[PDB]
Write a protein that binds this ligand. Structure first.
Ligand code: CL
Ligand code: CL
Lengths: 164, 164
């Protein structure tokens, strides 16, 4: 799409500020989840938390401004978590399909890394996201029935899984 | 005060997350100013923006959690701007007087640096802050009548000055 690119995060205070605004908007202005940045301080240490541990963090830029994000966190050789998946509303669905484009980039990396299972959680009230995830091939699963070396936040959220 | 300390900022993603939450709370939850972090990206480059340019940035910590902040930005040998002055409500006034304690630390540095003028702006609706500033010896001034190598944000705000 015109003037738009998705790329791996690199330390940049301008993009980081924009990323924080994106996350805050989606979580707290749009979804009203009241999530503090202290509850997700990995955002302030992306290189060490994601990139240096066989994971990755991507940002979508429109005219060099952050308008979307997605991250992959490695749990083990087989399992990865899809995290920090956000897009500003106007980039969702037609015509830009930014969520799909971010999700596609996540997967080129996930497959190349030989992961066989991708897990994620999503708030129970986020119906739009649930249909989006199901259209990318994710199936819902129980928290007590998924065995994974990862703890999902203590919120009213659904767990989804996609086997590669 | 018990388990409390004010110190110069040092790169720390945990404190940075907490600082962002403090700033967001004061600006956007409490004061409803709708300020984006992209409008104050100096927060993500404190060392280069403040500390490496003869300015400074302080954080107040209670039990190693950021609960207040204040910063000094050097304009020239004579003038400095007081910026990013925030405190969580329960630390204001008696018994902790955190705003005063932060303001006192700012001034030990301002005087040692030989500044003779300190300027700041504050939203016109923030009556509590205006009385607080007047009690620290600041007098109001007009934007068109203050000659300073600095541009205050384009908001409904008052400019205050304190001569040392
Ligand atoms: Cl989409
Ligand atoms: Cl105070």
């Amino acid at each position: 799409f015109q003037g738009m690119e998705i790329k791996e995060y690199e330390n940049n205070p301008y993009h980081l500020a924009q990323l924080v605004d994106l996350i805050n908007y989606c979580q707290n202005i749009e979804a009203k989840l009241d999530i503090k940045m202290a509850e997700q301080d990995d955002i302030f240490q992306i290189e060490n938390y994601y990139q240096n541990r066989k994971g990755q963090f991507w940002i979508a830029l429109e005219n060099e401004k952050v308008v979307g994000s997605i991250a992959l966190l490695r749990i083990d050789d087989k399992t990865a978590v899809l995290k920090k998946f956000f897009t500003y509303p106007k980039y969702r669905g037609n015509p830009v399909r930014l969520g799909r484009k971010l999700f596609e980039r996540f997967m080129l990396f996930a497959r190349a890394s030989k992961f066989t299972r991708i897990v994620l959680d999503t708030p129970e009230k986020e119906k739009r996201s649930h249909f989006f995830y199901e259209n990318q091939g994710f199936k819902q699963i129980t928290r007590d029935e998924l065995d994974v070396d990862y703890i999902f936040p203590d919120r009213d959220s659904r767990i989804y899984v996609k086997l590669l």
